[PDB]
Amino acid sequence: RVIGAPSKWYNENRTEWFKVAQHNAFNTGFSGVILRALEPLLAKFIYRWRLDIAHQRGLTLEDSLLFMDRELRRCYFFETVARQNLHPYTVLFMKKRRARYYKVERGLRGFYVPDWVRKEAEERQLSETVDNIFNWENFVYREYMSDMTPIGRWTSLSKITPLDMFQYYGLFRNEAWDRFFYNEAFYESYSEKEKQEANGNPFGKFNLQTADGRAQFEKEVNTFIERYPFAVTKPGQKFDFTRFYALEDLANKRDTSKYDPALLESVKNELKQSAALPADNGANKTKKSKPILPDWLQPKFGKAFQA
Amino acid sequence: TSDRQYSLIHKELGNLPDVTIHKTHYLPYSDTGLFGSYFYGNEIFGNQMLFLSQMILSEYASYINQAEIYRARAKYFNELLAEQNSADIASSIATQVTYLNRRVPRSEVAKRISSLDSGLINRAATRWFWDKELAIVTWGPSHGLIAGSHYNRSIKRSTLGWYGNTHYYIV
């Protein structure tokens, strides 16, 4: 054991850990080639299965991946965080969609939503869902995971059953038996090199500057969009690569000369409007209530001098 | 929460929301001495204020934690290094010469406390706290404390650390 600087107990973000883990699993080693060979089955039986069920219910992957079902009901931690940080309409709108489906579903089972609900569901793409999921996970980690400290304890509930009184926590916890002090150094972490590897493009090591690399990238993206409907484009639509290349070129601050000024202006427009935070203006206010006592609770009209 | 720190008595006090003041007094004299605790709080926590200090001291006789030992050692080191006022220094030197006919160096006191460990602390607290008689004074509203005022089984067993926990944890 090496004693270093003190730190918080949770020093790893779940999202970054899972990003590096999935990059290592899918783009490194024999497991990588196995997973890449198993891609069509996973696309058919995981992504498309859930997508079809959600579309039938009139929902998207929002309602199944942003906040879990066990979180929207009976989760005091999520309820506390939401009541302390969130505006009501997030959870309210998710619950409203659930209710608008299940009111009919409970009355008469086997319910398929009409086309005007399924279309509204399909309007939402997976990119905005990824933004919401990542932002929520990062916010929860930063604001609450970094504040808590696990402690050894017995059961939370007082159960008269002897089989439940003697429960032990921390005796077989890996982190608890790996670190005994808050000054202890951290062991077995992701390296900075492999952390930077996961920040590359998730398709391949080909470069987009060479014309040969662009063709392979376009083929891979076409296969991805053909296997993942509604993830990045509508099924009828076609992915345009010139705008993506302009985005990549502007992000890396390379020579953006081959692009016409109108397309560059547009690309900047979506770049700066897809990251804007919505703000409120006093546009259409509603009347505020100022109740007064009713007439029968008020003194009768008429007063004399009362000499 | 009060348990996320290295002081058992502070955890217990933080549990009680209307026990405001606690202080530990050591009053050495020539051929006698007193060591005890003063509590100031609400009347509904009278039993807690009556039993907590002796319970803690007796548990220290039975078993003490290295966290407690190191916290106390660091505190008393800092107290030794924090004397700059000349009036306090002069008074302390005068009292030390009065009672010991010498001035005790801070290095010597630091070495004396640093030589302590869990076993020596346990033996000292067995000598001075484990199964001992007490002097108790309560001053104030005693509506809830008049039933068991007399020096009785509860008070006698209060000095047995875990074996006299009955009347502290009922509140």
Partner: protein
């Protein structure tokens, strides 16, 4: 007796679920302090002191 059980249970549930819902915009300058500073839980006596500290 099967038809009468169906009547009571399923028909009653289907009748009870025939509700009308309306949502309106409220912008009268009143904050949702009751949402931010509200909430109860019966298992708080179990959660307190142990969970999420």
């Amino acid at each position: 007796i099967l038809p009468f059980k169906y009547f009571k249970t399923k028909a009653y549930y289907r009748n009870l679920l025939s509700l009308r819902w309306e949502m309106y915009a409220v912008r009268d300058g009143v904050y949702y302090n009751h949402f931010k500073y509200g909430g109860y839980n019966s298992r708080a006596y179990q959660f307190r002191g142990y969970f999420w500290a």
